[PDB]
């Protein structure tokens, strides 16, 4: 998910501009739900995933808010000591404590029911047990017992009118999430929210700890430790799920890293390129970053250095010259199925070869498979989420940086060979593979574009629509599932705020029993594809002026 907030000093023809692109995957019907709430302290407009009570994206006329997932480490695993004799017990602080337990029956349509038991300890639910070692793993979340309060914080923040009021609610949001602020006076802010454990000295948060008592967390760190910044010297806040701050540790996921190679740099280069940005230019960054190859920037200098002493008729050099002329923006041909330049296909094959020779080679099976992906892997329906830089490519980037990388190279990933020899062998592999399928004339290579599917199954893999309700878009775009833009104090209007969004396929997913589809079932789908947007209304006058219908209810509690 990406976000760019532009404040007073960087904005052109407004005091503040917020553009959010939450990336949750693409679904039919739409992942978020549009809703305006006017009464009982509330005066809000925006859209929110699964119609939560609190609007994750929107504004109240004074301030605006947005989110990106967080990825701090707020979950650790406690290895609990069981006993062969006295089962259902576990050792904690010198006594054998009994487990909480519950029985569950799964009713099955056209099958027998199934019952099983769920176990829990002071640390959390038991994930798995090792009977051989008499160990059980408990997953322990820092937000445990604060789920409901996190939902309420997201609701109550819609009423804040300033920084102070807003951070009071951000302090109560316990999940690891980045929250962003903007207001009518042009102030902008950021908080990496959530509850983080206050761990005992010597606790490596990447691996399990014994659950017998000595490693228990001491409590939670205060909200003053949460990374946060208000009205930054730079004039802007940008995030693509990238590290909040210097020295902040990331999730313990093996596939997740905050390294020198990061896709947020792509947003930074565009915001640093212009002294000020208009609303229309802030919206335009969606289109550039959607189409940008993320590996070009990283490995072009290495490819250039290695093929510098090569002759012009050397195919490995021809591949690098193609890359050197490319700006890295993918564009569809007229056929609607192939890209105009073969760049991504070349980097994809190269990178796959480079990892097989370097990172993959140093890691024992079967963990070598964790580091092979190039990051271009999709299927015919296209990627299920955002495109990113793969773990293996982030590890390889540190290795090609030499002693300019801060990460000690315990193993030489090039295994004694000069870098350029490994780079050139991979480039030979790339030429062999691609020329075999497209031939030797690089200029007529028509490589396959990625496409985009609005899926009928939700993110769990469960149907939320019939399979024919699936929608297909020819151009894959690395962009938010929805895009929303709030512009405060526009010099070009008399309105204090102006906001836009796009919620595809449509606001409604209703289909009558005779198969008649709602009028608002898919009236936002072409708008999505062409980077368009619709206005969000807040004031009464604007809502009346664009009203298409009205319904009044009289109800007493």
């Amino acid at each position: 998910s990406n976000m760019w907030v532009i404040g007073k000093s960087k904005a052109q023809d407004a005091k503040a501009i917020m553009v959010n692109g939450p990336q949750f995957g693409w679904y039919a019907p739409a992942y978020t739900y549009g809703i305006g709430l006017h009464g009982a302290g509330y005066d809000v407009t925006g859209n929110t995933p699964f119609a939560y009570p609190g609007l994750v994206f929107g504004h109240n006329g004074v301030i605006s808010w947005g989110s990106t997932a967080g990825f701090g480490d707020d979950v650790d695993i406690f290895a609990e000591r069981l006993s062969a004799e006295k089962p259902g017990y576990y050792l904690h602080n010198g006594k054998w404590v009994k487990m909480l337990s519950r029985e569950e029956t799964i009713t099955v349509k056209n099958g027998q029911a199934e019952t099983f038991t769920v176990w829990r300890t002071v640390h959390g639910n038991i994930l798995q047990t090792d009977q051989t070692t008499q160990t059980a793993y408990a997953k322990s979340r820092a937000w445990d017992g604060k789920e409901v309060a996190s939902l309420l914080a997201w609701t109550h923040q819609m009423k804040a009118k300033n920084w102070q009021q807003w951070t009071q609610q951000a302090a109560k949001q316990a999940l690891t999430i980045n929250w962003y602020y903007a207001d009518v006076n042009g102030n902008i802010g950021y908080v990496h929210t959530g509850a983080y454990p206050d761990r005992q000295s010597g606790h490596d948060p990447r691996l399990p700890v014994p659950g017998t008592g000595k490693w228990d967390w001491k409590g939670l760190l205060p909200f003053e430790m949460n990374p946060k910044v208000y009205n930054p010297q730079s004039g802007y806040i940008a995030n693509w799920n990238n590290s909040p701050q210097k020295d902040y540790p990331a999730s313990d996921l093996f596939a997740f890293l905050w390294g020198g190679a990061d896709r947020v740099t792509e947003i930074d280069r565009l915001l640093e390129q212009k002294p000020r940005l208009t609303a229309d230019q802030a919206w335009d960054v969606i289109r550039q970053t959607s189409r940008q190859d993320l590996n070009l920037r990283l490995f072009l200098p290495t490819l250039q250095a290695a093929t510098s002493g090569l002759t012009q008729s050397d195919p490995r050099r021809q591949l690098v010259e193609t890359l050197t002329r490319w700006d890295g923006i993918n564009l569809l041909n007229d056929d609607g199925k192939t890209w105009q330049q073969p760049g991504s296909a070349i980097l994809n094959v190269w990178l796959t070869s480079m990892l097989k020779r370097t990172v993959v080679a140093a890691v024992p099976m079967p963990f070598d498979k964790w580091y092979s992906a190039s990051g271009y892997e999709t299927t015919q329906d296209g990627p299920t989420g955002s495109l990113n830089i793969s773990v293996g490519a982030k590890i390889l980037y540190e290795a090609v940086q030499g002693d300019k990388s801060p990460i000690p190279q315990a193993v030489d990933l090039f295994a004694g060979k000069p870098q350029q020899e490994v780079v050139l062998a991979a480039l030979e592999d790339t030429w062999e593979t691609l020329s075999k399928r497209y031939g030797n004339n690089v200029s007529n290579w028509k490589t396959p574009a990625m496409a985009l599917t609005f899926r009928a199954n939700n993110f769990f893999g469960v149907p939320q629509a019939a399979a024919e309700e699936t929608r297909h878009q020819a151009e894959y775009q690395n962009r938010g599932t929805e895009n929303d833009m709030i512009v405060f104090s526009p010099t070009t209007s008399d309105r204090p705020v102006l906001a836009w969004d796009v919620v595809a396929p449509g606001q409604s997913g209703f289909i009558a029993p005779d198969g008649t589809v709602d009028k608002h079932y898919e009236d936002q789908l072409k708008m999505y594809e062409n980077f368009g947007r619709k206005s969000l209304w807040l004031t009464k006058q604007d809502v009346e002026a664009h009203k298409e219908s009205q319904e009044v209810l009289h109800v007493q509690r």
Binding site: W143, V148, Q245
Partner: protein
């Protein structure tokens, strides 16, 4: 009027709710959610509680067990039981609003029942505050805030220890899965603060 809820939809069908107190406000919200996205919401509810195999069968029994293994329902009910009356109103309002539209749908299914209920053979059920809270827990806290690979990390570490020996295995582990890397591009500039 304290009993009135006015629902205005715009040109794109986006509902705006006008109401005077908490419970009427969120009752309106739930009511238009039930009008626009009932089948989606119903599948989400089953997804987040692990009750998919009841309407969809044997292919979803593992899924349902995995969902129930990952939370503790009594803990969620206890948090709901401690809300103040104002906070409780948000959740109850919303479930009541849904229930109002689900009542008319189950009363006039020939015109009001979403096609996919007939297709998949089952009908909507009434909601309580616990169901509203489990939508958010299930799809926000468990999708984006529950990530850990600590057990797999230890299996990698052990394997690097066997291949490169004890100290060397650890130093390779920090090469592949570093704790922090000081060159990472950050949202906060170093001039403002550091962890």
């Amino acid at each position: 009027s304290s009993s009135e809820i006015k629902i205005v939809r715009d040109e794109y069908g986006m509902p705006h709710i006008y109401a005077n107190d908490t419970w009427h406000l969120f009752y309106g919200y739930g009511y238009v959610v039930a009008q626009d996205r009932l089948f989606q919401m119903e599948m989400a509810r089953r997804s987040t509680q692990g009750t998919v195999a009841e309407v969809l069968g044997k292919d979803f029994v593992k899924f349902d067990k995995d969902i129930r293994r990952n939370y503790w329902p009594d803990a969620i009910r206890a948090q709901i039981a401690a809300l103040s009356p104002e906070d409780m109103s948000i959740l109850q309002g919303y479930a009541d609003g849904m229930n109002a539209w689900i009542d008319k749908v189950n009363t006039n299914p020939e015109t009001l029942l979403p096609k996919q209920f007939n297709t998949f053979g089952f009908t909507p059920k009434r909601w309580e505050p616990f169901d509203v809270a489990m939508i958010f827990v299930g799809t926000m806290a468990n999708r984006f805030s529950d990530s850990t690979s600590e057990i797999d990390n230890l299996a990698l570490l052990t394997a690097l220890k066997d291949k490169y020996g004890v100290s060397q295995g650890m130093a390779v582990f920090n090469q592949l899965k570093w704790l922090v890397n000081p060159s990472a591009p950050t949202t906060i500039a170093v001039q403002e603060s550091n962890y």
